[PDB]
Symmetry: C2
Subunit: 433 residues, 2 copies
């Protein structure tokens, strides 16, 4: 997959000029046609501001106005119609109208938009053109792209290239070169924010206190997220800290995440007041960090959903899951722990023994000291602490148990144990923020 | 400590307007006064393209010209004395001059500039304004800030704000609000990239390939990096993987890193050809990723120099170092491993036994047949692998061995062990 993303301003006010890029040459007002010719992307994404729109009879007429104007210009230049247009909420008082709201709305809207576009299977080569963009929309688009690509890198290889053209001088300019200003192999960065308190999903920009309290109090999301919060924070922690069994047992409900994001995103869109006479758009609700955390959580869930399997979890499965999610010293300590449990099963098997629903402590043969569940041991033993895990050996007739024991030995958290791990990991996630 | 960074283009062509910010109001051509009033910055930095320079006698007359007119403007709106100004290398054909070079030189030059300004001690509250910036110089400045603060976050609390104003639109604007476009607590991101091949410290932009090979061969930096490259990647690995004994033994020479950066910086500057008649600057050398990696490596070293304890390295010191340097599961893993060794030393101390210069495998009492040094065991056991570490206990008269053993028990890599570990960590960093 090759993805070209382009940050745009007022594309009608652009002058014709020449562009050099990849030994090719292009006469036109925009960088997009030569960028497509050289890079040959599988998909193009154009990111521009609401403040280009010249219609205030509706919020959906305002967008179709902008989308049409963009579709004309793509015919004007040689640009293909294979594109997505993210019409992001911009700010400021213009001659053709007025737009007010949180300036950070643009980030959260593009973040959510890009989460539904960037593929969640396969490698990503990403090209971002910033030549034509507004400073603040281009930073917030750059920030939103990077933050999602980082979650993508956990499971897949992600290369990111960024271009800007030579600055434009009215009639001195003969040919602007399109420079590469970044080429990066994107580091894997799993989500490491806890979900915030219920003040930080939607905030009131221009709305009477009681109306806001009614909208907030109407949201199913905030009600459910109260009871679910800890289990989701336990899942986030299982990627960050190297807990392969917690990852499987705590794997989120994608449908319920999809539900929360759509409810919050719909409430936002609905509270946009477009006053048609006086040419004015007020976004009376602002997005909060909690919306971005949900968008990112659902994107990390989609990226990793391919690893999930049914409820009997074998040491061999935990090995395979671990080799995708983890790297460096985290990957290696996980393998040593699975090693210790695996080697003990091989011993049990040579003796013709197959214990079932036995605590890991009894399975490894520990002393009667320390029945407490400390953060230390839960995090140091890749979440496979001896007082919280239950082991089951599915009976078989060994002949080479060294390669057979992994498929037949299953780990499970106890119902009591899982609650102790969720606290420790949830607290450890919040204490690292 | 509160810091204010701003991105500037041509600050003369800016009209008077009024700006609202944080229960305040101000009238001027720029946001800096009201930003400086509301935010009470302990220090301020301004990043401008050099492409606003007019007098092309040579390089020091451009930077001079640009610094003069800036220092005029900062008196016109009373921007105080607590200020640094970074004249970054821009490119393009302008009305009063032409500038040629890699577009990425402004990233590395500003990264270098910022690396000597940002405090490497105590917490940081960084405020960034992009209102008056060129797109690319503002994006590279933002990227350069984040890269360094991420390293500072290893050791200190770092909070970051970005601002941009409502657009100035000349023929309807009454007043412009200063919007906060970002509020973030900066995640600790240790340096996580190997040093590259000796092609990628300085690259020729417009130098004939025979002249480049000449000057690459005269740099004392690339010859001294030949030796150390592995020893430095080992150190980078020590933070990233949780190897606190390797962090101490491989702790780089800051004076020697300083001199490498300055030799690459002053070699780049000395390949800038200025033509007074053609009004044309040409940067014939471009900075490579490797220049960026050295600047970041020197920055991580200054940030953590405080953790380099005196010899010998005791289990108590390794605990102390570890507690500062590592978080989450990596910290808990390292603590359990030092605890294995400590608990052993306690048992020895109780029997009045004080083994001196004994391999860790004999101290822990291991089987034979396992003297191969694997990636797995070096990375999984916090670099304290039983075939590469030597233990000593300084004998004493114990009263509470559970408190004393920590202070009197010293670890170090064997000379053979350290070279194997360097190879394993260096390699693990390259596969990343």
């Amino acid at each position: 997959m090759k993805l070209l993303v382009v940050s745009w301003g007022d594309f009608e006010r652009w002058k014709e000029t020449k562009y050099r890029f990849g030994g090719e040459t292009s006469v036109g007002p925009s960088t997009l046609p030569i960028l497509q010719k050289v890079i040959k992307p599988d998909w193009t994404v154009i990111v521009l501001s609401d403040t280009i729109g010249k219609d205030f009879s509706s919020v959906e007429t305002l967008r179709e106005d902008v989308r049409n104007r963009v579709m004309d210009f793509l015919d004007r230049i040689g640009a293909g119609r294979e594109v997505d247009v993210i019409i992001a909420p911009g700010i400021g008082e213009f001659t053709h109208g007025s737009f007010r709201g949180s300036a950070m709305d643009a980030y959260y809207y593009v973040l959510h938009a890009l989460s539904e576009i960037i593929p969640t299977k396969g490698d990503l080569e990403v090209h971002f053109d910033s030549t034509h963009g507004l400073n603040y929309v281009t930073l917030l688009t750059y920030r939103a792209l990077k933050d999602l690509l980082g979650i993508a890198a956990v499971m897949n290889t992600v290369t990111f290239y960024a271009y800007n053209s030579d600055p434009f001088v009215p009639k001195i300019t003969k040919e602007l070169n399109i420079n590469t200003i970044e080429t990066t192999m994107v580091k894997p960065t799993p989500l490491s924010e806890p979900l915030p308190g219920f003040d930080e999903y939607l905030c009131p920009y221009s709305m009477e206190r009681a109306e806001f309290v009614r909208l907030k109090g109407s949201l199913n999301t905030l009600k459910n997220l109260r009871k679910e919060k800890k289990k989701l924070e336990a899942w986030i922690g299982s990627l960050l800290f190297g807990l392969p069994l917690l990852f499987l047992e705590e794997f989120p409900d994608i449908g319920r995440l999809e539900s929360y994001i759509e409810e919050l995103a719909e409430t936002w869109g609905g509270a946009i007041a477009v006053n048609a006479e006086e040419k004015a758009v007020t976004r009376r609700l602002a997005f909060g960090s909690g919306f971005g955390t949900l968008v990112k959580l659902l994107f990390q869930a989609r990226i990793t959903r391919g690893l999930l399997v049914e409820e009997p979890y074998s040491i061999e499965k935990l090995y395979s899951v671990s080799d995708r999610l983890f790297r460096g010293s985290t990957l290696q300590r996980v393998r040593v722990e699975l090693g210790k449990i695996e080697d003990k099963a091989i011993k049990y098997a040579r003796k013709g023994a197959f214990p079932r629903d036995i605590p890991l402590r009894d399975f490894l043969g520990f002393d009667a000291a320390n029945r407490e569940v400390s953060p230390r041991n839960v995090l140091a033993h890749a979440g496979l602490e001896a007082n919280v895990v239950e082991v089951s050996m599915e009976a078989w007739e060994p002949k080479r148990p060294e390669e057979e024991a992994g498929r037949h030995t299953h780990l499970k958290y106890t119902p009591v144990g899982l609650k102790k791990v969720e606290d420790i990991v949830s607290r450890a996630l919040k204490e690292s923020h």
